[PDB]
Write an enzyme that holds these catalytic residues in place. Sequence first.
Site, PDB file in Angstrom:
ATOM      1  N   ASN A  18      19.149  17.498  -7.409  1.00 46.56           N
ATOM      2  CA  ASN A  18      19.733  16.192  -7.727  1.00 46.56           C
ATOM      3  C   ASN A  18      19.700  16.071  -9.269  1.00 46.56           C
ATOM      4  OD1 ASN A  18      20.274  15.203  -5.141  1.00 46.56           O
ATOM      5  ND2 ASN A  18      18.178  14.611  -4.773  1.00 46.56           N
ATOM      6  N   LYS A  20      18.226  21.746 -25.486  1.00 46.08           N
ATOM      7  CA  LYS A  20      17.246  20.790 -25.925  1.00 46.08           C
ATOM      8  C   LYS A  20      15.980  21.510 -26.322  1.00 46.08           C
ATOM      9  CE  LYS A  20      20.128  17.559 -25.651  1.00 46.08           C
ATOM     10  NZ  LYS A  20      20.591  16.766 -26.810  1.00 46.08           N
ATOM     11  N   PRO A  39      14.979  17.512 -21.104  1.00 45.24           N
ATOM     12  CA  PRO A  39      15.096  17.427 -19.644  1.00 45.24           C
ATOM     13  C   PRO A  39      13.721  17.358 -18.933  1.00 45.24           C
ATOM     14  CG  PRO A  39      15.504  19.607 -20.481  1.00 45.24           C
ATOM     15  CD  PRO A  39      15.624  18.708 -21.641  1.00 45.24           C
ATOM     16  N   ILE A  91      18.710  12.902 -20.569  1.00 42.29           N
ATOM     17  CA  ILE A  91      19.425  11.855 -21.289  1.00 42.29           C
ATOM     18  C   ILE A  91      20.682  12.523 -21.864  1.00 42.29           C
ATOM     19  CG2 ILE A  91      19.456  10.207 -23.135  1.00 42.29           C
ATOM     20  CD1 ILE A  91      16.324  10.169 -22.824  1.00 42.29           C
TER      21      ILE A  91
END
Lengths: 114, 114, 114
Positions: C97, C32, C1, C64
Amino acid sequence: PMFIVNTNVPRASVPDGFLSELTQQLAQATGKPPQYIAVHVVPDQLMAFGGSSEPCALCSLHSIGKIGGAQNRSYSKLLCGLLAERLRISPDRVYINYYDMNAANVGWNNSTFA
Amino acid sequence: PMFIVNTNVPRASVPDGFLSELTQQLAQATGKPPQYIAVHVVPDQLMAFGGSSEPCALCSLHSIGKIGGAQNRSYSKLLCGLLAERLRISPDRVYINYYDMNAANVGWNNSTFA
Amino acid sequence: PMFIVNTNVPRASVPDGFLSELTQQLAQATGKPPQYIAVHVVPDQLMAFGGSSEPCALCSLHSIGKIGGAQNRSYSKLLCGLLAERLRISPDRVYINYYDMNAANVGWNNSTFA
Ligand SMILES: */C(S)=N/c1ccc(-c2c3ccc(=O)cc-3oc3cc(O)ccc23)c(C(=O)O)c1
Ligand SMILES: */C(S)=N/c1ccc(-c2c3ccc(=O)cc-3oc3cc(O)ccc23)c(C(=O)O)c1
Ligand SMILES: O=C(O)c1cc(/N=C\S)ccc1-c1c2ccc(=O)cc-2oc2cc(O)ccc12
């Protein structure tokens, strides 16, 4: 709405009350309560447009929904006009990227808008 | 195109003329004139990559078309190469987010591109 | 991230080790490896939320995958919680966001992830 302006215009040239004005103008344009409006002005940046570091701006306007986009033109006239009048940036040295976010992809108050 | 670089490299280690260098390199890569190229470099940032504060960058490239396919990899080679050679940032500590914008979602000069 | 926080709280209020804390908390939340996580904290910003200059933040989390309805709700509590406890920002003055990036659209190490 969330409006972000990145500019090479110096901090001292940003008028007192400019964030207030953006907020009020965005409330008028969207018709939505001003309490949800976020504004972010970032002066003193190292920027160029067309190879020149004359005053310019790179902006983002985020809105939350799915049918959003129809007001982009109207916003461009409004926001370019504000950057021109207040920060003395020529409208032809401004880009504004419009992002219509899915409610599930916006966090607020510990959760999302889904 | 609009290219933005956020880095923890200090302002003093950003070369003089680096904005022009980015502009020229993007003009060659796109095959289009410098006129509509916007670049933004943000040094001195409080950043970490992999839990380390060694030099790193977070970048964005926005383009109305002219990206995707094998073009994203080609941009990455170009842009990582520039950041390595000029800013001395290791390519393995750079992320570049590619955004293929719809013309109707880009404002410029009081209007939108579609 | 990749996690970016833009805030009007001063740099002087950001605790030493906040970047490391964000990296570890993001690792455990997204699952991650910390080695791949980028964090960027941008204090001292000219911002308003609801027309007020009380502490606020505009954030982005790009990943992702690992982005979706339920995941984003969990991330919002985690990230608002850290901003509240560490930076004294009320969760109702934060937007996050979330962006689900395709690997083909993320450059790294002279190439792309797909
Ligand atoms: C700019 S981004 N204005 C803004 C911000 C938030 C909201 C709003 C929601 C928008 C879209 C949704 O699907 C749900 C929403 O729920 C809420 C709930 C509460 O308590 C406050 C705001 C929102 C709007 C909006 O259009 O309502 C607009
Ligand atoms: C980087 S973002 N370079 C850039 C920006 C805008 C334009 C350009 C358009 C691009 C895509 C379209 O669908 C329409 C466009 O229309 C115009 C119109 C005018 O007057 C100026 C620029 C654009 C380009 C481009 O190469 O044309 C490039
Ligand atoms: O493996 C991952 O899920 C991954 C997560 C990341 N975290 C935040 S943006 C960043 C990158 C990746 C990753 C990565 C993510 C998606 C994908 O399709 C391929 C990927 O390949 C990698 C190869 C590497 O050597 C190192 C990392 C990746």
